[PDB]
Swiss-Prot record, chains A, C:
The chain holds residues 120 to 326 of 399 of the full protein. GO terms for cellular component: blood microparticle; extracellular exosome; extracellular region; extracellular space; IgG immunoglobulin complex; immunoglobulin complex, circulating; plasma membrane. Changing G1A: Reduces the affinity for FCGR1A about 40-fold. Abolishes binding to FCGR2A and FCGR3A. Impairs ADCC of virus-infected cells by monocytes. Decreases binding to complement component C1q. Decreases complement-dependent cytotoxicity. It comes from Homo sapiens (Human). It is linked to Multiple myeloma: A malignant tumor of plasma cells usually arising in the bone marrow and characterized by diffuse involvement of the skeletal system, hyperglobulinemia, Bence-Jones proteinuria and anemia. Complications of multiple myeloma are bone pain, hypercalcemia, renal failure and spinal cord compression. The aberrant antibodies that are produced lead to impaired humoral immunity and patients have a high prevalence of infection. Amyloidosis may develop in some patients. Residues 1-104 are annotated as: CH2. The gene is IGHG1. This is Immunoglobulin heavy constant gamma 1.
Length: 207, 34, 207, 34
């Protein structure tokens, strides 16, 4: 039968007032004979009506996928409100309901540290600019890089790792040609997290 | 992004003099009039 | 019905002649009425007999799980030999076969770089010693820390992250009291990987 | 661990003058006798 998944908003979207955080309800394997789905959305059990439900799309096996997207208020997500998607179909005797909310627990402020390339890596054609982010809770976080007021997109970030004191850490690695680094360009690690002032901090790294 | 509005969002979010209704309205104002 | 999992050896065990690499075959959810499994082991399709099979043990519920462990030659694992576990049981019409082997692909040597604590972290009670390991393939790798010839176990290592050139990187973080760091103790990141000379390299870090 | 044996193991493992049989034997002697 049809199964339902409910996805949380992107961490950055809940934190930055310039973005729109959304919760996403996905139902898959809707049969071909009963192609129609109805979504009901709830915030702390109270039905809401502002969802964007697009029409169902046929997949390979002739079954149907159906997506509904609910935009949520930044402060409601951060304040722990509970978002529920209910999926109704004729092939189902009872509707399926999933529910999600923000990770519980006292938030903890990430400490952000930039680490320049070691002298040994300077012998290579490219070097690694490192951003260590440690001590944060919950694990929802966004990390980005820029230089000279322009985004740097050539970085990889590790998943959060649970540390022994109940907080998380990660590292973000920006690869740059050693020539750019040696010409003294300023690079910046930007971190977005609930427990940071303004939800935002930027740490610089330069030769 | 506009750092002005992000600062105003955050200060409203954590203002202890605002209750949930007042906080929502002031955040809505920032969202809409930035 | 019964299901079978086949686990590879630990990366360190295949690499260090002091260690004994092992492949492990686990069958779960064996019926209570037939608490009886037969393991057959094969190396590149040829049956081998040196496995250590422990008697089945019954879990919660009435079902049993059953483990067989096969020791393998370091060079055979590294040279891509294929290890197969066959699980036979009266409930099953057909035996269940699982096969594993080393990840395939040209091995690439990890580059190992230690990064001292950020000058801005020296205001805290504890500091972070960082080991960057990059450029390695396959992802099988072991990372440990030492100081003054004794193991340091208070570290966390990120899972490997696939970089954009088909190689992997990771960071390992050792937390030390700032006092230890400032009194000049030498700390060592040790990395084991098939593409390192002697499968082993150690890089040092100190004030 | 003993670094001597580990060096000998690695040298035996990559010695291009050893076929599989000769490599297995040299590796087995290393593992067995130190």
């Amino acid at each position: 039968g049809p199964s339902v998944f409910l996805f949380p908003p992107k961490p950055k979207d809940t934190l930055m007032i310039s973005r729109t955080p959304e919760v996403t309800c996905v139902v898959v394997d809707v049969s071909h004979e009963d192609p129609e789905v109805k979504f009901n959305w709830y915030v702390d059990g109270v039905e809401v009506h502002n969802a964007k439900t697009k029409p169902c799309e046929e997949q390979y096996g002739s079954t149907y996928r159906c997506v509904s997207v609910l935009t949520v208020l930044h402060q409601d997500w951060l304040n722990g409100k509970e978002y529920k998607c209910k999926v109704s179909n004729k092939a189902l005797p009872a509707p399926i309901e999933k529910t999600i909310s923000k990770a519980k627990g006292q938030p903890r402020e990430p400490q952000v540290y930039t680490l320049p390339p070691s002298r040994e890596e300077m012998t290579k054609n490219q070097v690694s600019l490192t951003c260590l982010v440690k001590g944060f809770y919950p694990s929802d976080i966004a990390v980005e890089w820029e230089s000279n007021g322009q985004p740097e997109n050539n970085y990889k970030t590790t998943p959060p790792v649970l540390d022994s004191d109940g907080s998380f850490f990660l590292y973000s690695k920006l690869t740059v040609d050693k020539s750019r680094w040696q010409q003294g360009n300023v690079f910046s690690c930007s971190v977005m997290h609930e427990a940071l002032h303004n939800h935002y901090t930027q740490k610089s790294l330069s030769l | 992004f506009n750092m002005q509005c992000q600062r105003r969002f955050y200060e409203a979010l954590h203002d202890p003099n605002l209750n949930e209704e007042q906080r929502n309205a002031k955040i809505k104002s920032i969202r809409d009039d930035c």
